[PDB]
């Protein structure tokens, strides 16, 4: 079958989530009873979905995430296997369970409304990451969660990199998606930093451009800051000071926006990993994300 | 001859408790999440059981995890499983229930999985001598009319003390159920049905629908914070006020609770007036608690 | 549709996961041998009884403890395949389904069982109290937790005091493992099965001796049955007359796992059909003999 | 260049512990039962990890539940997973192991599930600069010869102090494994292979087979309760007696424990005599313990 060659995979570190998805014909009225058009299970979590898209795009990838044995684990693991995502670095846990997101998708508009049920699964630790043999990966993408622990991980990778020739340097990306103050440290790590519109608004920014000019001072020297802003497309700012923008590329009809953000992030990583410019990565990300929005789930993108 | 039979649906309720109703396109954290056996007739068995009346659930099931959960839960409440009917296609339906803990509202996204209904032919095999009361949740009305006629015919051969009392619930607003009004000693009509039919109060609905019941029958309409009313053959409109709890936290199955409490009270020989008061009392208590257990 | 009254045979007892290794020769201690094959098969005396009953065409139900999980999904899936009624499964919040590691020697068809208990709570008398008896014409109880099973047997007897003859429930008990608490069960049921292993453990050299020596312990009117593998089986009832059937050996004996369950279930079937004790004995030997020439159970029919 | 790589099999050991060895056709109750990650190279990493030596497992796995257990366990011992090779056909082999707690004996019913082996093409991708020692469990000899030739060629460009040390285990009496004797710094031959070659002691086996090893190589043969012997280039036969525990409860993986401990000792720069003694000491200790953890 083949040993995985050095420096050949993209690693994504973060959460797996079970999405239990109900499609409805209009957004439910409070205290009413509505009939589901359909209902399905779908693997989710930001880093988990990134691997789906990377895979679909034809990038070898690996997922590192906590896991608990069980029926839900069986489903998300089996799904991860379907997309040939390398799972050697799954971290099994003896307490807690995989979280469940109950997702209401309104077919009127493609909107998605998420009721998140946390089930106490322990996060991947810095001492878990210490065990990872870095020779396997050309790019490591980290979904911000437990900051002080992830900082140690990012520090580990930077230290590896001080010992590597240019062909063997590991590119790093970070996602700051949840509006929690402890994630603010993460801006100062990584070659590419993704900040969400949600965090941007919570941090007092009115636009993507304002967010990027406002937060660029927090990134490490040389970093590219990326902020996606839904129907207003996506922007980026790198060390040259030039604000880059892509318009959104909506499909003719929006039916399912769940994981559109992850589709953007993964598409930007793919494009950059393939040696495209940041400008090109931005447009590709918005194009792939918009195509996804016209489809149920992820498969029809390729 | 001492059991109460409840014929209807069983539903898996997958319940999420939230601090406010979710805005569309937002992500909110659940305070908690639980599985709960539901369905109208199924919930009625739960309350009867808690009140101390031996009961049996008659309804369709399918093999698998969901049915195993609901069967186990039925067992925990000592609900007699003799008349469960295992179907070879379809699956137990699943209600995703959002309970807003700000108000106790329950919003239900219902996912049907094509489970066949129990038929008149299934009902023909039921041993009617086991039951003092049979309650039918309106579902497949042409078949259920045949069940009701079976009970009626049975009752023509019984002395007074051996007569099986019958209640019917019309709880979904589907016209095919109108037929069912014409059977039973007690007929329950839901506020939701009443409102869909154009009615704006319990008394308005009772006066608007009493034409449809058979001679001697009592029509009953519960109206949430407005208590419950009843109208019987003497023409006297009866009412109980509600019994709201200190805070309403969970109104899922409150109407089932009311119906079961009324059946319990009536099956025990109480007046329709006392039956309304007790249904209002128990259902109001239920609304102040998660699930059903704390009612007793 | 709805199961008619008095129509099913209920079997109360254990479900077990059998993990079966087929080997060309019985392994020598401290050696390493290659498995010819390896399979998962649902087992447990009461569980296996239902398989045979379903195969013979008798509507049946299984009541035993179950713990959610993978092993449960395997045995539950397999129970459903034979259309066994599962409404009286007693799911438990502790413990797991036991695993029996079984070595089958292809040279002889012997079965050696390494049994691993996984602390699953047993079906209790309170559990049994909830069973609506109107569904069943025959109840078979695999002896396990005897003081609780005696209450179940007492409940069935009381039920029967209120039934016309068409509605009387017939009862069998199995004493298969040589454990002291079980021997109390000899005194209940219309039909009492005692294994060759138990007989030998109590110091009896033959099916005849075991039946003479144990008959004083059964209740008035009962039939005591003791199968003796390749020597056939015996039965003894109130008339003091020992009945026998010789074994019906297969061309080659390839798998004897569940032969005893096959026997028991086929006797129950034949009796439940109104056959004589002599005929049920014969038929039990006939079906268990056939099973011994086949891997698993499906080939009996 | 500080890790030890162990190339060979992982096997799932499904272990039943009993108080007596089973009589054929009987039924016996297990004292206990457990899964243990096994296989010669896999066990080697467990021991190296416990002794304090950073190591890596190279070997085939198939995605699925069993691999998840194996990877988790490897994770727990901090064994580097980089050179695990995922196969798209076959599955991890399963060894059903009966351990008689009265003697500590282990009887193995092996179920092979057709897992493709690690190839020399896989080995070509290994970063040799990561490792100071490489241990190869003899299996697919023509492929492993190519691996050993690759290591030899790498060593021709290293100075004395950056040379990769190499061990080979010949554990099966298969004629194809004999060519592996000519490779490596340390060659392990089991008591079983030795007896099959007609040797009646470790001393006879060493004398009889030393001619098959390359110039300067050390040949080692463990003889269980009789200890272990070695022979190197000076021609001096070395021996250590066994170190039996108070009682022998579990001898599964005792050969792997010996080999790994010898490798460890030698990797730390100890004499061959000291390494023999240490391997006997650790292996002896293991045999008095269920599994591996209690050795340190």
UniProtKB/Swiss-Prot annotation, chain C:
Biological pathway: Carbohydrate metabolism; fructose metabolism
SUPFAM superfamilies named among the record's database cross-references: Ribokinase-like (SSF53613)
Broad class of enzyme this protein falls into: transferase
Gene3D superfamilies: 3.40.1190.20
Tissue: Most abundant in liver, kidney, gut, spleen and pancreas. Low levels also found in adrenal, muscle, brain and eye.
Molecular function, one GO term: identical protein binding
EC number(s) given by UniProt: 2.7.1.3
Keywords: ATP-binding, Carbohydrate metabolism, Disease variant, Kinase, Nucleotide-binding, Transferase
Disease connection: Fructosuria: Benign defect of intermediary metabolism.
Quaternary organization: Homodimer.
Protein name: Ketohexokinase
Lineage: Eukaryota, Metazoa, Chordata, Craniata, Vertebrata
Gene of this entry: KHK
């Amino acid at each position: 079958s083949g040993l995985v060659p050095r420096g050949s995979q993209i690693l994504c570190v973060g959460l797996v989530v079970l999405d239990v998805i109900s499609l409805v014909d209009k957004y439910p009225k409070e205290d009413s009873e509505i009939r589901c058009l359909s209902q399905r299970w779908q693997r989710g979590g930001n880093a988990s979905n990134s691997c789906t898209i990377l895979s679909l795009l034809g990038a070898p990838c690996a997922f590192m995430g906590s896991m608990a044995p069980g029926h839900v684990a069986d489903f998300v693991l089996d799904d991860l296997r379907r997309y040939s995502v390398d799972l050697r670095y799954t971290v099994f846990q003896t307490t807690g369970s995989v979280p469940i997101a109950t997702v209401i998708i309104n077919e009127a508009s493609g909107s998605r409304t998420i009721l998140y049920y946390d089930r106490s699964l322990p996060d991947v630790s810095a001492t878990d990451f210490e065990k990872v043999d870095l020779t396997q990966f050309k790019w490591i993408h980290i979904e911000g969660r437990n900051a002080s622990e992830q900082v140690k991980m990012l520090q580990r990778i930077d230290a590896h990199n001080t010992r590597q020739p240019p062909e063997q340097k590991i590119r790093v990306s970070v996602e700051v998606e949840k509006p929690r103050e402890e994630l603010f440290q993460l801006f100062g790590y990584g070659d590419v930093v993704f900040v969400s519109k949600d965090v941007a608004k919570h941090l007092g920014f009115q636009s993507a451009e304002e967010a990027l000019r406002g937060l660029y001072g927090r990134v490490r020297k040389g970093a590219v800051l990326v902020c996606a802003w839904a129907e207003e497309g996506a922007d980026a700012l790198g060390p040259d000071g030039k604000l880059l923008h892509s318009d959104a590329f909506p499909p003719p009809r929006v039916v399912d926006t769940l994981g559109a953000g992850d589709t953007f992030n993964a598409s930007v990583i793919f494009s950059l990993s393939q040696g495209r410019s940041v400008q090109e990565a931005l447009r590709f990300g918005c194009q792939v994300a918009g195509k996804k929005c016209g489809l149920q789930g992820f498969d029809g993108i390729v």
